[PDB]
Symmetry: D2
Subunit: 268 residues, 4 copies
């Protein structure tokens, strides 16, 4: 059976088999969910890099900045899951901020064009995935986005934090649209997960000054977290997203679940 047994869940954001979305997809399939995966205009690129999930899953093209991809999402999901089936779950794990908005570009030097793209994909596309999929979501259904607690400013994250503040705000509005469908909308605020993107940042692609800043932020999590924080382990975070996809948090929406080791709840 498993936690998500029977549930039809669309999972966006997988880019690598170390993506938070990939582990979310993984844990979901292990828990019996039936997935529909999405990846940007690169349904063929997500093809190479996800033949690694426990079960096969239809993969669909979605560039969330593409209003056509969005108008047709519901259409192709249905095609994918079977006419007469609906989604039980939607995982939005799409986050992106041009590195001009997050990494060593001064916070002030991030062009709005880039911030705006960061917010399009990171925050707004949450409302657009909700708009696209809510009509093909079952009551008791669950939308989950990925958050990184922006409630305090932090070095390097910069405009991405801004985008996550925006996303949290968007989440409470999604929940209110979502609740007309009996659907809940929540975010999972993850502690830092050193994946493909994060390790190059800390590896100094976005330079010494930002890698340092991220490293020192990211190391504060484990010190802070009463239960610690392994940034190399997406599983706790994937399991939390699946808890949100399950029927075990039936009265939470508009909300944020911290899967951060309890870091956010401790000063030091």
């Amino acid at each position: 059976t498993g936690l998500l047994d029977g549930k039809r869940i669309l999972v966006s954001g997988i880019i690598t088999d170390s993506s938070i979305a990939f582990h979310i997809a993984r844990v979901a399939q292990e828990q019996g969910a039936q997935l529909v995966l999405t990846g940007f205009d690169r349904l063929r690129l997500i093809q190479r890099i996800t033949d690694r999930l426990p079960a096969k899953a239809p993969l669909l093209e979605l560039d969330v900045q593409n209003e056509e991809h969005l108008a047709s999402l519901a259409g192709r999901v249905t095609e994918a899951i079977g006419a007469g089936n609906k989604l039980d779950g939607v995982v939005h794990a799409i986050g992106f901020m041009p590195q001009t908005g997050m990494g060593i570009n001064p916070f002030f030097d991030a062009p709005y064009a880039d911030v705006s793209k960061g917010i399009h994909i990171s925050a707004y596309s949450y409302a657009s995935m909700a708009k696209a999929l809510l009509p093909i979501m079952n009551p008791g259904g669950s939308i989950v986005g990925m958050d990184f607690d922006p409630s305090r400013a932090m070095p390097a994250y910069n405009w991405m934090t801004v985008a996550k503040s925006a996303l949290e705000s968007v989440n409470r509005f999604v929940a209110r649209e979502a609740g007309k469908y009996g659907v809940r909308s929540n975010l999972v605020a993850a502690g830092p997960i050193r994946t493909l993107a994060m390790s190059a940042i800390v590896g100094g692609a976005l330079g010494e000054e930002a890698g340092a800043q991220i490293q020192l932020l990211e190391e504060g999590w484990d010190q802070r977290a009463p239960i610690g924080w392994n940034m190399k382990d997406a599983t706790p975070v994937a399991k939390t997203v699946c808890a949100l996809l399950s029927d075990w948090l039936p009265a939470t929406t508009g909300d944020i679940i911290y899967a951060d080791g309890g870091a956010h709840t401790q000063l030091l």
Copy 2:
């Protein structure tokens, strides 16, 4: 198979079979948990109630304000669960504020003795129960208290709100103690549930003024909750506690999960 399968879980606070504790225990059992219940005083009267549970559970005595109680709990639990066995969960679902500090009475008119007693039971006993039980908890274990979001003042909850503020703060310190045991500590902040004392609040014993203030409270909650809020139904709360008791929020502690229909995320 069940969410909580193979979990040993202490549930405190079942005083009647409608109190969220009862529902927690019930769902916990339906999820495959082996319960140790606590009660104090009317212990033969509490076993009459816990007899209405799906499964037998040892009922131990525990006045949470007391020590031949608290200091002996771990021992008595260990005897109840057996040599070699530890608890995976602790549920604190004890809330008491003398009615002088409740909705009927002016905020300024609650004596400290009563406030103090209400905080002892509702907040400080959370630390007490963690102190008592942590030694006999398994890593990955989970302590959950019951919260009623006190971040905004509400009339006709008065000092109880204050007690829940205190609880929330206690929860975060407990988490930091619990983490040393690999153990989570969280609060489930429930929407308003009618019991036999929060029921006896609205039922008549509060008189017009406090009964109307509480109904205005509870009705706005349903309005606010994007997925709605059912005053009468403890299940969503009970499931949430169980989520928390499960392995599915392994990265959450010091924290609060709002099982409140999302009301706290919406202004109207």
Copy 3:
């Protein structure tokens, strides 16, 4: 005498004489501030309106979306205030959301173009103005923007709420930059004031259907506010901004001061 004696303060966002900006600027002047005003699209109507102010203040053009206006702002402000003088205060009271992102229009129907513009104006420009003006601010300086508590979703406000969420996040990052200059950055989270966007999609008229939600929403401030809320009266919010522009809140930055009658502290 006067809170703001000797202080030079840039006030942006005066479009009207009822606008929070107008009253901030008036209060600042009554308090002995020397103002610089900025404005954009109807600059001669603006000059008419800034006349209704106790003292004349130069109006400089400033389209916050215009990077060249921004790049030139300090030098114009400086020529306006005389060389060797720097600003002590900056008021950002610019907030705008294309009404696709507000009022009667779905949250889901706002094109991103519109959300992006509103966030540009409402949130990003706060960092823009900080960037433009920090170089010409005195230590002990203050930058204040206008917030509307977006911590909880509400009907109508929609994408403007999201932009206010972004703005609060923007503000904390701006504080971090501003602090280098010994400058504070804070937001005043105002209760609702009727002017030309919390009253021109309001207006007690865009249907007797969902105009009702917003009416419920907005009359909830006065009712929630322990000291009440007067929607017609920008003075208390203007005074709050002035306190932040003063030296009387010298240890507060990256922060939000709620000038809302304490409504957001109260659930009902």
Copy 4:
């Protein structure tokens, strides 16, 4: 002239001359306020300290744990300020947790009688004084308590933190009551300041480990604070308290002003 000119302000909790409390009174007097002061057992030692204040103030006796002191205070305050004179401000700067609930003693080991006493003095007495004093406050008045951000758990502060959480809640409720008199109630959430029992309770009289763990705690402020935090300067806090005592924050109540260098707004 003066910020608080004409203001009759009662200030409680002056117990050292290095206090936030002592500096609130000093700054209040420098700003024209006529003070009334209160103290309890160490009455010679308090009358000594308050002599260090630039102006004479009546010192009245007030054990906030004493319902006779409280039910009486208003009469004595009137006696000292003169019949038909009301207070315009009340400052609650009474904070005390017995040692077992603070610093080095585990959080777990604090007996409730200590916790209860700390909460009585630190939180409940905020409602006590408001109740004692609201009847003799002017509309336009202002009650201010001293907070220390308890939103996240930190080492050492322990049950003091819990007390602070409770106070924050108490304040929101005080605002309800107070708002019936035209009176605001707010807390100033100060950064760590080094007092007398902070040249003891972190200076050199808790241990070696409680003058380096509270020190490590407290020095993260100045790191985090965008405009910095001087542990030794209670003036920014005293001034913030006076802002709140002034008419410059007329729309804020039930609230918390963070005079903490903006530290709570920033993660690293």
